[PDB]
Assembly symmetry: C3
Homo-oligomer: 163 residues x 3
């Protein structure tokens, strides 16, 4: 709080002592540079919690969405939440996608890209067939099913990101 000096022989001493006590007391309830048990507040700095942090409301992390046709009709939808990317595979295969081939319509943007190669396991509607798509750190996704020219690929999960 903004306070005024108190000193011997001071002019208007009781008033200044009171003004100071009030200015300081004000910041114990709201405002100033102190974090309080009520109120909407923005907190800067590295805050390290050594105990148990319990969130009863919501924990909101940085979020961003993206969707694109990776290639061959396969559509990847992403939502970044903190250091995790939630993915969903969709669309329908529209042309021959060769075994172990790069999907070269659209790459995953760098902000959604993992540190390491992530293998996203999926299933084709209608039978027992599984595939995976790798997202490397470059974002050029790669199809690791066999050669396929049709069908409906699906799979929801997550992969990690960092910063």
């Amino acid at each position: 709080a903004s306070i005024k000096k108190v000193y011997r022989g001071m002019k208007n001493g009781a008033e200044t002592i009171n003004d100071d006590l009030e200015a300081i007391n004000s910041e114990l309830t709201s405002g100033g540079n102190v974090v309080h048990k009520t109120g909407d507040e923005t907190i800067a700095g590295k805050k390290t919690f050594t105990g148990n942090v319990e969130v009863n409301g919501s924990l909101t992390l940085p979020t961003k969405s993206w969707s694109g046709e990776l290639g061959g009709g396969i559509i990847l939808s992403l939502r970044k939440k903190g250091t995790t990317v939630e993915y969903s595979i969709g669309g329908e295969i529209s042309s021959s996608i060769l075994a172990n081939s790069n999907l070269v319509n659209r790459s995953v943007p760098n902000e959604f890209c993992p540190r390491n190669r992530c293998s996203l396991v999926g299933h084709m509607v209608g039978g027992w067939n599984a595939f995976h798509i790798d997202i490397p750190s470059s974002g050029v996704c790669q199809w690791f099913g066999p050669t396929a020219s049709s069908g409906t690929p699906r799979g929801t999960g997550t992969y990690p990101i960092d910063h």
Copy 2:
């Protein structure tokens, strides 16, 4: 803190100034409406951290568990933790489950339901067969394997929720 007024010509001034300073100083160490570097405390309000939040103890989010037989002997076990649902598929197929059919014994409750269709990829014990089960926002789960009358479906992962 609860303080008393200080003023000119005041009765018992030194005592009141001291009582005030002590009341205020007390809340710099514990209690009142200020968050401290020690102590168990409940904090209300929207707290926005613009820096790095580091948790060394535990981060505890709202948690809830549920398990049920979706249909055809397939059992889904769920644990909600914040905006993420951890799932585990189990049981054994007990009757004919037709391709792309709704599982109509029990639905996933709304509090465990996703915003969008989530495709949960799984594997059948004993061979190379994969399937997926979709959980739509309605919670009426849908089997996207082919027609199956037996076997042991498994798969653990997560899907997102929001509020």
Copy 3:
């Protein structure tokens, strides 16, 4: 803050009142036992947030990495982040791995072990074949594909942990 007593007839009263007000005011901006809206600070105690916690920087949880050859050439790479373990399956099958057999080269260490059996679904490069590996709470992983003597298993996801 460290303050000195104020009292009637006191020696050097104005100085002491001022020193106290300054000591207290100092802790409203930085240091002491109060959490502030700026500065790097370590916070002990159970902090329960009943409102909305919004993190704009980073949320950092306890992290630890591990990788090992589970058995048969299958390599599992793990990163624990809080109560979640991010996994990646790799390597190449190097010898006959019997159906539903324990992988008995290396177990997952206890700190990476789940509360319950986690079924990690994966895909074999080059065809439509899926498998899963179970990680029980003991960490002795188990192969639930059929008998396999070759091929390239992949799959990235997460499973939960607790404390």
